[PDB]
Amino acid sequence: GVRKGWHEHVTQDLRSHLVHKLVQAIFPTPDPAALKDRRMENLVAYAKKVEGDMYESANSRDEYYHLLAEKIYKIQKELEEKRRSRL
Amino acid sequence: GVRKGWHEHVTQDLRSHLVHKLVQAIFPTPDPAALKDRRMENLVAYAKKVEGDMYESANSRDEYYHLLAEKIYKIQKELEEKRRSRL
Amino acid sequence: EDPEKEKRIKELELLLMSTEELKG
Amino acid sequence: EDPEKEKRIKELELLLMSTENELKGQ
Amino acid sequence: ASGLFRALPVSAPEDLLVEELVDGLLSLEEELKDKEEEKAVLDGLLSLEEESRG
């Protein structure tokens, strides 16, 4: 739905922790020398753009979480299809 | 000018290859996921309409190539102006 | 198509909502 | 006013006309 | 009436066709750029897993 000014109740700290969740959900890893790699930094950069786009597309905080969850799901399925086609 | 019966020297394979040129000149793209897309199929269909129209409007083979070239130019120019004014 | 798509999406929704762990 | 208009039209005309020879091909 | 020679309004339909053509190609173009970024990111993650196979 539409909640006027819902951005005023979403702090920058929350968005940044949400960006971290998108990364963790797409590529779970206990930093085995991974956060420093270029390929992981490109993921963080793509995750910020996904969060940025859904932050403006959504019109309430419930839409925000909904669209993000559906975008993560679609990215996981894509990663999982490419991982299979390589077996 | 007018060159009677210039159609008798235009093979179907030439017209079909000319359509391929119109498409590539308007929207060159390596991505194979484009040839299947509906926005690309609308381009091939528009290219065949233009080629058909210029094949009947032109009255010589030199008019044929000239009009086709000007229609490609007008479309490229439109793409480039909306591409630069895009939000 | 995917029979668990609805299940996985709801699991993801909860994952994100639980971030609000910053002050709980 | 797009001074390269004439240039671009002629480049496209050559593009199209060069199809006649390349259909000789193999 | 001299409306017997009224020229046909053929210009609007033709402009509409070009407009939708150009809109689709710009739409396609943006979507293609984004789907290529995604491929590169995911290709980069798959090659990150393959390294950690031991």
mmCIF file with all atom_site columns, C-alpha atoms in Angstrom, chain D residues 3-20:
data_model
loop_
_atom_site.group_PDB
_atom_site.id
_atom_site.type_symbol
_atom_site.label_atom_id
_atom_site.label_alt_id
_atom_site.label_comp_id
_atom_site.label_asym_id
_atom_site.label_entity_id
_atom_site.label_seq_id
_atom_site.pdbx_PDB_ins_code
_atom_site.Cartn_x
_atom_site.Cartn_y
_atom_site.Cartn_z
_atom_site.occupancy
_atom_site.B_iso_or_equiv
_atom_site.pdbx_formal_charge
_atom_site.auth_seq_id
_atom_site.auth_comp_id
_atom_site.auth_asym_id
_atom_site.auth_atom_id
_atom_site.pdbx_PDB_model_num
ATOM 1  C CA . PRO D 1 3  ? 26.089 18.964 -40.221 1.00 0.00 ? 3  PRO D CA 1
ATOM 2  C CA . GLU D 1 4  ? 26.932 15.258 -40.505 1.00 0.00 ? 4  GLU D CA 1
ATOM 3  C CA . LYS D 1 5  ? 23.490 14.563 -41.947 1.00 0.00 ? 5  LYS D CA 1
ATOM 4  C CA . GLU D 1 6  ? 24.712 14.313 -45.533 1.00 0.00 ? 6  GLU D CA 1
ATOM 5  C CA . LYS D 1 7  ? 27.724 12.273 -44.397 1.00 0.00 ? 7  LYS D CA 1
ATOM 6  C CA . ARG D 1 8  ? 25.635 9.787  -42.422 1.00 0.00 ? 8  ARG D CA 1
ATOM 7  C CA . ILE D 1 9  ? 23.105 9.332  -45.234 1.00 0.00 ? 9  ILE D CA 1
ATOM 8  C CA . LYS D 1 10 ? 25.895 8.569  -47.723 1.00 0.00 ? 10 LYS D CA 1
ATOM 9  C CA . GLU D 1 11 ? 27.572 6.153  -45.305 1.00 0.00 ? 11 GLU D CA 1
ATOM 10 C CA . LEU D 1 12 ? 24.265 4.311  -44.979 1.00 0.00 ? 12 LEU D CA 1
ATOM 11 C CA . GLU D 1 13 ? 23.781 4.287  -48.759 1.00 0.00 ? 13 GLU D CA 1
ATOM 12 C CA . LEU D 1 14 ? 27.205 2.676  -49.144 1.00 0.00 ? 14 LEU D CA 1
ATOM 13 C CA . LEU D 1 15 ? 26.331 0.241  -46.362 1.00 0.00 ? 15 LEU D CA 1
ATOM 14 C CA . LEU D 1 16 ? 23.246 -0.886 -48.270 1.00 0.00 ? 16 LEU D CA 1
ATOM 15 C CA . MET D 1 17 ? 24.793 -0.890 -51.758 1.00 0.00 ? 17 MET D CA 1
ATOM 16 C CA . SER D 1 18 ? 27.666 -3.081 -50.584 1.00 0.00 ? 18 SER D CA 1
ATOM 17 C CA . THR D 1 19 ? 25.130 -5.880 -50.097 1.00 0.00 ? 19 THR D CA 1
ATOM 18 C CA . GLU D 1 20 ? 25.047 -6.619 -53.837 1.00 0.00 ? 20 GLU D CA 1
#
